[PDB]
């Protein structure tokens, strides 16, 4: 607890890599969603408790509900005011523009490297405290 992050990602290999990277950054409270509907549902449940996820990392292509539609639902239907950052195998400027215009705050392309994750967390992640040689 303290920092709480949602990783939305249909590929289990990618889930496991970002989870380990976040753990190494001292963040242990990581939840996983496999598609955009599950993401909506989880943010929706936490919405009741009266707390945000500090951050959501959102994949774009996923079955059932993709990350663009997921973001739209989370923004529009739920309160949601905290950061959502695309984390995706995309790509080019069309994809980045689309993600930002859908209500995502930022954009990371896979592979995500540890130093770049550090920068995103410092930028966007509320209670995050980072080290350090």
Partner 1 sequence: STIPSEIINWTILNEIISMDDDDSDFSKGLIIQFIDQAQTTFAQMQRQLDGEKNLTELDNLGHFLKGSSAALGLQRIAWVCERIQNLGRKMEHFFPNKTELVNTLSDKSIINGINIDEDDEEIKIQVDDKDENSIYLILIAKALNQSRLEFKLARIELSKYYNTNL
Residues 7-26 that bind partner 1 (CB under 8 A): 10-14, 16-17, 20-21, 24
Least Å distance, CB 83 to Na ion, is 5
Residue 89 lies near ligand BEF (rule: CB under 6 A): yes
**25, 35, 38, 59: which one binds Mg ion (CB under 5 A):** 59
Least CB distance to partner 1 at residue 94 (A) = 10
Question: Which entry of Na ion, ligand BEF, partner 1, none binds 47, CB below 5 to 8 A by partner kind?
Answer: none
Residue of minimal Cβ distance to Na ion: 82
Find, among 110, 133, 106, 111, the residue nearest to 122 by Cα.
106
Strand (E) or helix (H) holding 6: strand 4-8
Q: Which residues are annotated as a binding site for Mg(2+)?
A: 9-10, 59, 110
Note whether 59 binds ligand BEF by CB under 6 A. Answer: yes
Which letter does DSSP use for residue 32 in this model? E
> The tokens of 47 are what?
């919405």
CA 75 to chain centre: 13
Kindly provide the b/e burial profile for residues 29-48, where b requires at least 16 CB atoms within 10 angstroms of the residue's own CB. Answer: ebbbbbbbbbbbebbeebee
Out of 52, 70, 88, 102, point to the residue binding partner 1 (CB under 8 A): 88
CA dihedral 14, 80, 125, 40 (to 10 degrees): -20
56 interface partner picked from ligand BEF, Na ion, partner 1, none, CB below 5 to 8 A per type: Na ion
């Amino acid at each position: 607890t303290s920092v709480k992050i949602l990783v939305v990602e249909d590929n289990h290999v990618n889930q496991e890599v970002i989870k380990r990277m976040l753990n190494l950054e001292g963040i242990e409270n990581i939840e996983l969603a496999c598609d955009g509907q599950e993401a909506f549902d989880k943010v929706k449940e936490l919405t009741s408790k009266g707390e945000n996820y500090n951050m959501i990392f959102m994949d774009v292509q996923m079955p059932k509900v993709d990350g663009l539609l997921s973001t739209k639902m989370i923004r529009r239907d739920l309160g949601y005011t905290s950061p959502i950052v695309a984390l995706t195998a995309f790509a080019d400027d069309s994809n980045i523009k689309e993600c930002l215009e859908s209500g995502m705050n930022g954009f990371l392309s896979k592979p995500i490297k540890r130093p770049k994750l550090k920068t995103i967390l410092t930028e966007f992640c509320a209670a995050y405290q980072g080290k350090k040689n």
